[PDB]
Amino acid sequence: MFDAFTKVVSQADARGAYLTTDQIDALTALVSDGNKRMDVVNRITSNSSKIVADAARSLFAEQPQLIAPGGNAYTSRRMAACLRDMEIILRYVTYAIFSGDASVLDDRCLNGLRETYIALGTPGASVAVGVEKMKQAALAIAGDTSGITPGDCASIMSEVASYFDRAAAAVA
Amino acid sequence: MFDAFTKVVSQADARGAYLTTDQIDALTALVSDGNKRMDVVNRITSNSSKIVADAARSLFAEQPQLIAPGGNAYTSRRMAACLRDMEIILRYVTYAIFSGDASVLDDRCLNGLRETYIALGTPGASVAVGVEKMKQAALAIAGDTSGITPGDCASIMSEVASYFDRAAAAVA
Amino acid sequence: MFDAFTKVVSQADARGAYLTTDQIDALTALVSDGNKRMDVVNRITSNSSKIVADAARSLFAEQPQLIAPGGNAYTSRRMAACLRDMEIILRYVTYAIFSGDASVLDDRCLNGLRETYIALGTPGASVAVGVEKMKQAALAIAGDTSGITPGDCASIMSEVASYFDRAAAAVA
Amino acid sequence: MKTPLTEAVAVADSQGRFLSSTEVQTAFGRFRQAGASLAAAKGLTEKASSLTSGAAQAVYNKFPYTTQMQGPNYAATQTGKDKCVRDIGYYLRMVTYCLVVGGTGPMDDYLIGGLAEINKTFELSPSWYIEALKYIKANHGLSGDPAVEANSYLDYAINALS
Amino acid sequence: MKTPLTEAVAVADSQGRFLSSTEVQTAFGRFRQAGASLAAAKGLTEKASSLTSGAAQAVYNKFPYTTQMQGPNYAATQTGKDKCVRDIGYYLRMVTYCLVVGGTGPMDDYLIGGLAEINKTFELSPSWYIEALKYIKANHGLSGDPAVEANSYLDYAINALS
Amino acid sequence: MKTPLTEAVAVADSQGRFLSSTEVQTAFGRFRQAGASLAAAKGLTEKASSLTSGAAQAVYNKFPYTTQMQGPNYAATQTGKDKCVRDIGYYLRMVTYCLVVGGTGPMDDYLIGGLAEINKTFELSPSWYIEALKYIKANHGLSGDPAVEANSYLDYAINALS
Ligand SMILES: *[C@H](C)[C@H]1/C(=C/c2[nH]c(/C=C3N=C(/C=C4\NC(=O)C(CC)=C4C)C(C)=C\3CCC(=O)O)c(CCC(=O)O)c2C)NC(=O)[C@@H]1C
Ligand SMILES: *[C@H](C)[C@H]1/C(=C/c2[nH]c(/C=C3N=C(/C=C4\NC(=O)C(CC)=C4C)C(C)=C\3CCC(=O)O)c(CCC(=O)O)c2C)NC(=O)[C@@H]1C
Ligand SMILES: *[C@H](C)[C@H]1/C(=C/c2[nH]c(/C=C3N=C(/C=C4\NC(=O)C(CC)=C4C)C(C)=C\3CCC(=O)O)c(CCC(=O)O)c2C)NC(=O)[C@@H]1C
Ligand SMILES: *[C@H](C)[C@H]1/C(=C/c2[nH]c(/C=C3N=C(/C=C4\NC(=O)C(CC)=C4C)C(C)=C\3CCC(=O)O)c(CCC(=O)O)c2C)NC(=O)[C@@H]1C
Ligand SMILES: *[C@H](C)[C@H]1/C(=C/c2[nH]c(/C=C3N=C(/C=C4\NC(=O)C(CC)=C4C)C(C)=C\3CCC(=O)O)c(CCC(=O)O)c2C)NC(=O)[C@@H]1C
Ligand SMILES: *[C@H](C)[C@H]1/C(=C/c2[nH]c(/C=C3N=C(/C=C4\NC(=O)C(CC)=C4C)C(C)=C\3CCC(=O)O)c(CCC(=O)O)c2C)NC(=O)[C@@H]1C
Ligand SMILES: CCC1=C(C)/C(=C/C2=NC(=C\c3[nH]c(/C=C4\NC(=O)[C@H](C)[C@H]4CC)c(C)c3CCC(=O)O)/C(CCC(=O)O)=C2C)NC1=O
Ligand SMILES: CCC1=C(C)/C(=C/C2=NC(=C\c3[nH]c(/C=C4\NC(=O)[C@H](C)[C@H]4CC)c(C)c3CCC(=O)O)/C(CCC(=O)O)=C2C)NC1=O
Numbered sequence A, B, C: 001m002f003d004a005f006t007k008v009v010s011q012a013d014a015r016g017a018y019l020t021t022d023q024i025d026a027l028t029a030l031v032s033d034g035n036k037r038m039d040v041v042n043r044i045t046s047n048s049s050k051i052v053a054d055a056a057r058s059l060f061a062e063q064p065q066l067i068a069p070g071g072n073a074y075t076s077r078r079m080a081a082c083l084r085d086m087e088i089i090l091r092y093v094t095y096a097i098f099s100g101d102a103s104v105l106d107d108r109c110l111n112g113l114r115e116t117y118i119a120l121g122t123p124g125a126s127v128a129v130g131v132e133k134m135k136q137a138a139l140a141i142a143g144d145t146s147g148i149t150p151g152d153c154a155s156i157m158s159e160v161a162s163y164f165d166r167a168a169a170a171v172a
Numbered sequence D, E, F: 001m002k003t004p005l006t007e008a009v010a011v012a013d014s015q016g017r018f019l020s021s022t023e024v025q026t027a028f029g030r031f032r033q034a035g036a037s038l039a040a041a042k043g044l045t046e047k048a049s050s051l052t053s054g055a056a057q058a059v060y061n062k063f064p065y066t067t068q069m070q071g072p073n074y075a076a077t078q079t080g081k082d083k084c085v086r087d088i089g090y091y092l093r094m095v096t097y098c099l100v101v102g103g104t105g106p107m108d109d110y111l112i113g114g115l116a117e118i119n120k121t122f123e124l125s126p127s128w129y130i131e132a133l134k135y136i137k138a139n140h141g142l143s144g145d146p147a148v149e150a151n152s153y154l155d156y157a158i159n160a161l162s
């Protein structure tokens, strides 16, 4: 995996280049906002049980055929697997917003997952609606103005949104 | 794997259904004939050395190119592998007639075996003639009216015939 | 793997045949030249560090994009892997000239290597230029008339050349 | 899916063995018990609505807050009550399946595998389901071997939750 | 396929090593022995019909019931006799291959692997083949190193059956 | 690629865990150090030609034979000198990368993995590179935390060669 800093480093090494002062400026910008980035990790993680359960509950309400007999989330084993899936993805998203780079989410989670779901017969689009739901809730939690120093977390929220959308796109 | 009883159960669970009284009637029918079903397992198993050897001997007589130099059953290793193959299949057939369901034969034996034989260069049709031979002998042994209480084992014989034909079809 | 002697044996067994007196004559010919065949193994092996380093040095000089940043032999890991590759192939070539048969080179080295390099993104043609370079140097070393009893090693050199060309063809 | 017959086959296959006399005795026992098992499954099935709704009611009686308290995990809503009886039906349906099967296999594969995650994740109390299983045990009105085997699976489900 | 040269290569490859002086001495020994080995294979080949038919006859003499008794496993039929001599030929052919090879490899790969299953499954007595190998040993009329190496493989086959 | 943040994630992922407070403290330390690290990388980059050519010169001074001796492994040619300074640049470039990264990861992945093979195979003396790294350490003219972290990676490279 990479993080924000090693991502620009790998890109530079590919080019036999030193990092440019502009690039360093952008990284120092990310560092100056580091407190906020923690908060995002901390808040999503702190509330991740709510997020998985609420997003799943909603998904099943919206697509009832999933929990009907014969359905892909029918039986405890298949339900457990699904809940585990939502958790694993949310976990990897938090890893990406923590690292400031997507590669960990790509490499250890998303890569090949689409094919896995086709083979399994898991409805990848359904997984994606659930990821989209976890995104709305994670941001509302993350972007909440209460119990915290007021400031602007707009960059981070777009960036968190990106990781969720990227995860949703991969299972599709 | 499933058996007679868990097969109808899995089919019912897929439908969120209780088992119907008619279904139970058919299972109680299988149970009332259980003694005979044992006999079939016992007799084939008791005579399985004869069955593998006689069916193989005949196969090689009918297709002599198999044991000619260069042939697929030429060399002790390849011959041993073949005899082992006939044994494994007959073993799985006995498992199916014992369980009253084919899934064990499908899952642990027949699934992917066709592709295995193409890759290996094993003549799948030849394996199938040998399975067909073991079927005739197993039934003659199983359906023999001597040293046993006379009765009708007609259902079981069709059912045993099915498993053999299913195994022969899979290697094809 | 086979050697000179087991190669003709496997070919004979496939045919249910004894080895012909002519075949034995050719093997006794190989045996009578066995001292020279050692020398070839011994000399290439004795000088194999030179051969890998010199052939690699030349390859990088001829194809500088390989050691440029972004290049396939750029970074110590990728360079180490490459040097290791040249060594492994030269090692297998020596095995073939030692055994008097190519199968060991085919089975444990060359088989599937082309596909491995495509997947990896390794330039198979480049590997092949390097094998071609190691061939010229190995022969010059092997065929050197100094510090040795003068004689004719012409058969062996063609045969050594074959193994190198076969290795170069496989990575292509 | 664990039944007497599949367990016998699985294990011989572990050892690469043909079925011997040992396993044919297993089949003999399955056939001995199967009348009782199939009678019990039919008895439970035909009285399924009463038992299930009776058991749900028994859980609400024992745990009144489950019908008042706020939360999608509680029966405090029309829908929440619907879900609960549905789970209790699943339980009973599984008990019938085990009876048909002569083994806990159906329950293991369909209900028990991953249950603990489900209950943790949806904040459902094992103690609710334990009560219902106890109610069904008290109220099925089976007798003899049918009751004993039925009770083995109901009790197996309580061990699973405990 | 085990010969001196393939054994040397296999083992160095195990250790990821180039051939060293150790293995070149192995080649030296192979070349030393190879005259004797190749002479022996040619001697056996050219007298193959007599040895094979002589050895078959020696088995029938030692075990008379093998030509009388009922069964596809016995030489009690025209065809059964044909099969037997054929197996004995396979044995001799393998002994020649080992001689050409300078090792037991051909026999191991072509004859010995799975033999015990074959003999068990077709009800063939190891003791029959043991006798024939002993007859061939007595009757090839090789001398010197050729006889010693030939006898090593004939004896190796008897150990394999015993 | 080892940084503080990737090490924290890797290890929690080993245990299948969400990031906890432990790892958020890791991020806190990365951010604390990052000013110093990024300043150091910029300082080194902007003076790269002098350090690199100075360090090369320092190796030639310490090891004069490296500019006289015959061999593609020596700086005895116009091209050979070019190669040497290039390796020294690679080293310095890596030191900057580690500084940007807050970890040895870039050096480990890009330079140190397989180095020993390279040096053995091209007959390059670790002691040459050790000297240059020591020269760069002496001459970068960084101060404070930047110097300390920069020196950690220069020293890490000398441990790697020693
Ligand atoms: C939930 C929103 C949906 C759903 C999910 C579901 N998934 C599975 C099975 C698997 N899911 C994965 C995915 C991962 N494995 C990993 O290791 C990682 C990263 C660390 C991921 C993202 C895998 C590998 C499996 C197979 C193994 C297993 O079965 O546990 C199932 C079960 C399929 C089955 O028939 O067994 C289900 C049900 N199901 C839904 O209906 C939702 C839409
Ligand atoms: C015999 C009637 C024919 C025949 C058979 C033959 N089979 C093989 C090799 C394999 N056969 C299998 C099949 C199975 N493996 C399993 O584990 C199971 C279920 C438990 C089955 C049904 C497999 C996996 C192999 C490969 C492994 C091995 O080689 O033992 C061969 C050997 C092929 C070779 O070249 O080695 C042969 C000869 N051959 C005939 O000619 C008959 C028509
Ligand atoms: C060198 C002339 C060229 C080159 C080589 C290079 N190879 C690799 C990676 C691998 N090479 C192999 C080949 C073998 N593995 C074996 O086990 C054997 C026989 C015993 C052979 C012939 C394999 C399996 C790999 C993958 C494992 C590994 O990476 O070490 C690389 C690295 C690719 C990467 O991105 O990691 C390179 C660079 N590269 C060149 O540019 C030369 C043209
Ligand atoms: C009744 C005893 C109590 C109760 C029930 C209740 N359950 C749910 C939600 C679920 N129940 C399950 C249970 C199963 N799923 C299975 O697949 C199987 C085996 C085949 C079982 C036993 C599951 C998976 C869910 C969640 C998924 C779904 O909605 O179907 C709820 C809703 C929970 C929520 O948070 O939305 C309720 C209310 N609640 C009580 O208070 C009763 C006393
Ligand atoms: C002669 C010593 C006795 C004898 C021989 C006999 N053999 C067979 C049948 C087989 N023999 C073999 C042996 C081999 N097959 C091989 O591939 C190799 C190595 C290359 C050997 C040594 C095998 C596999 C068979 C069965 C397959 C086939 O028919 O070829 C028979 C017929 C057995 C049967 O039951 O049909 C006989 C009669 N019998 C004697 O009594 C002799 C003293
Ligand atoms: C300078 C201190 C001394 C010196 C240098 C010199 N180096 C080479 C050749 C190579 N150096 C490397 C080193 C690297 N390759 C990498 O990818 C990395 C990390 C990114 C490093 C540090 C390698 C791989 C080579 C060989 C491949 C190539 O040519 O690029 C030479 C030429 C060696 C040859 O034998 O051709 C020289 C001369 N030599 C001295 O005497 C200096 C004191
Ligand atoms: C390990 C447990 C732990 C955590 C996670 C933690 C985070 C942390 N977040 C901080 C600030 C902050 N956090 C935010 C975040 C937000 N502002 C908004 O209005 C948005 C809704 C929200 C977006 C996420 C902002 C704006 C600041 C002030 C910026 C700063 O000082 O960097 C600060 C500086 C001190 C402070 O202001 O409280 C710390 C130490 N401290 C800890 O001890
Ligand atoms: C573990 C060793 C063992 C076995 C296998 C066994 C089987 C067994 N088979 C039985 C009956 C039977 N078996 C058969 C079978 C047949 N009838 C035919 O005419 C067909 C040719 C044949 C088909 C397979 C029939 C018809 C009965 C009587 C039916 C019954 O009592 O169920 C019975 C009841 C008692 C009896 O009639 O002998 C037993 C106990 N008992 C044992 O102790």
Ligand SMILES: CCC1=C(C)/C(=C/C2=NC(=C\c3[nH]c(/C=C4\NC(=O)[C@H](C)[C@H]4CC)c(C)c3CCC(=O)O)/C(CCC(=O)O)=C2C)NC1=O
Binding pocket: C032, C033, C034, C035, C036, C037, C038, C039, C040, C042, C142, C143, C144, C145, C146, C148, C149, C150, C151, C152, C153, E021, E024, E025
């Ligand atoms: C284990 C260490 C070791 C090795 C490798 C070794 C090899 C070896 N090579 C030999 C001969 C030989 N080697 C060659 C080889 C060549 N002639 C040429 O002109 C070609 C340039 C070259 C091609 C490779 C020739 C022609 C002979 C004489 C042929 C013979 O006696 O077989 C001989 C016989 C004695 C001798 O002539 O020196 C030995 C023992 N001896 C050892 O103790």
